[PDB]
Amino acid sequence: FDEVFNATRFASVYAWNRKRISNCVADYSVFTFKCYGVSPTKLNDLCFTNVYADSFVIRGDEVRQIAPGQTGNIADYNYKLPDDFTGCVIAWNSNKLDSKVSGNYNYLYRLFRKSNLKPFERDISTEIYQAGNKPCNGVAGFNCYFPLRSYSFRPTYGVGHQPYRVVVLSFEL
């Protein structure tokens, strides 16, 4: 595991990049190393045969919503785990790395959608949304809303708005 933690830049939440780690004898030797599926008692001796590795940048207070079977703005519209989760959810803070003078605007999180998300599903499409009757052929600002909002991530806030990197490995068989 050398490619998915020391990466210079991470993706947003409205999208996210994962991988298909395989054929490597995962040195799980490798801060909230919270693991759900199988505890690290025997994580160094297994026969999993297939592993994924996602990547996400989110506010600290919203990290709890990553865990399966919970509701939230980013867990009900951006990324939701199934009820039978088998993996681990690692996460630390990036207070002095992702934060930037006057803040960073590159990160985003979807705010509106038609319906909830199914597990392990993403949708990247910036279009006007929302209505009763939707005669919104043009682009306007009443009930026709830009779906994404950018985090603040100012150079210095108190804990709770600072950026946390969270990686959610999804084991398999």
Partner: antibody, heavy 120, light 107 residues
Framework: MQLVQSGPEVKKPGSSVRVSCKAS????????VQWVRQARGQRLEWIGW????????NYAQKFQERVTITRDMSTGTVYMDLSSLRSEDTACYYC????????????????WGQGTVVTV | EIVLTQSPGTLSLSPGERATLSCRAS???????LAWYQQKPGQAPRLLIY???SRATGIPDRFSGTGSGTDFTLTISRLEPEDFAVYYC?????????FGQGTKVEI
């Protein structure tokens, strides 16, 4: 199902006033709440509006530099801040939002608050 | 920017009659973004029409609304004594937002 607004306030010229429009269900639900002023016997006059979701806001050019509409998700509160009070502002202030619970929204503005009287 | 004019200024008709009101604009306004309000002395405004053609829930059918382009109108078929009030026309399609002047109906 209704809007709650603070009681009357008293201010002298040059100060600033904060008015709270507190609703229920605003969080997690799109809701475009506007702000309208009305003096005694005069026509209604528009002030501002804000989207509870994204923070998007727009102010009248005249009332620019004098109006600040601020949002609070946790408490489901909306703040209307006015600075440098002038006698012409002495009027009743209403906050109106459309019926919005099921993601979608009633396009028209239907709910209206009880109003607040501000005099200076 | 958009200027709305409401006429007639005052009306004086007995209960049961038919009254008509005109709301005129200065630029094209989408017919899906116009509304009317009713105001009685001291109370909060009430929503009557949304979209210029859809009556709000529960309001009497005697109300009616049509129009397009830069001129919209409201018509009330059978008036009653409690309807004596002042009605404001609001176009709510294009920022900046705007209201009307007002009207009065009595006998």
């Amino acid at each position: 199902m209704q809007l709650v607004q603070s009681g009357p306030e008293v201010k002298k010229p040059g100060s600033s006033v904060r008015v709270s429009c507190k609703a229920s269900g605003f969080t997690f639900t799109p809701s475009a709440v506007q702000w309208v002023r009305q003096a005694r016997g005069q026509r209604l006059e528009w002030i501002g509006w804000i989207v509870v979701g994204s923070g998007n806001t727009n102010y009248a050019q005249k009332f620019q530099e004098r109006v600040t509409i601020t949002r609070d998700m946790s408490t489901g509160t909306v703040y209307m801040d006015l600075s440098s009070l002038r006698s012409e502002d002495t009027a009743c202030y209403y906050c109106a939002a459309p019926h919005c619970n099921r993601t979608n929204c009633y396009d028209g503005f239907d709910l209206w608050g009880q109003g607040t009287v501000v005099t200076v | 920017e958009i200027v709305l004019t409401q006429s007639p200024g005052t009306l004086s008709l007995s209960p049961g009659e038919r009254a008509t009101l005109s709301c005129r604009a200065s630029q094209s306004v989408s017919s899906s973004y116009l509304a009317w309000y009713q105001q009685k002395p001291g109370q909060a405004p009430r929503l009557l029409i949304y979209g210029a053609s859809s009556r709000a829930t529960g309001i009497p059918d005697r109300f009616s609304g049509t129009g397009s382009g830069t001129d919209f109108t409201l018509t009330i078929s059978r008036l009653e004594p409690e309807d004596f009030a002042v009605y404001y026309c609001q176009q709510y399609g294009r920022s900046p937002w705007t209201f009307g002047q007002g009207t009065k109906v009595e006998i």
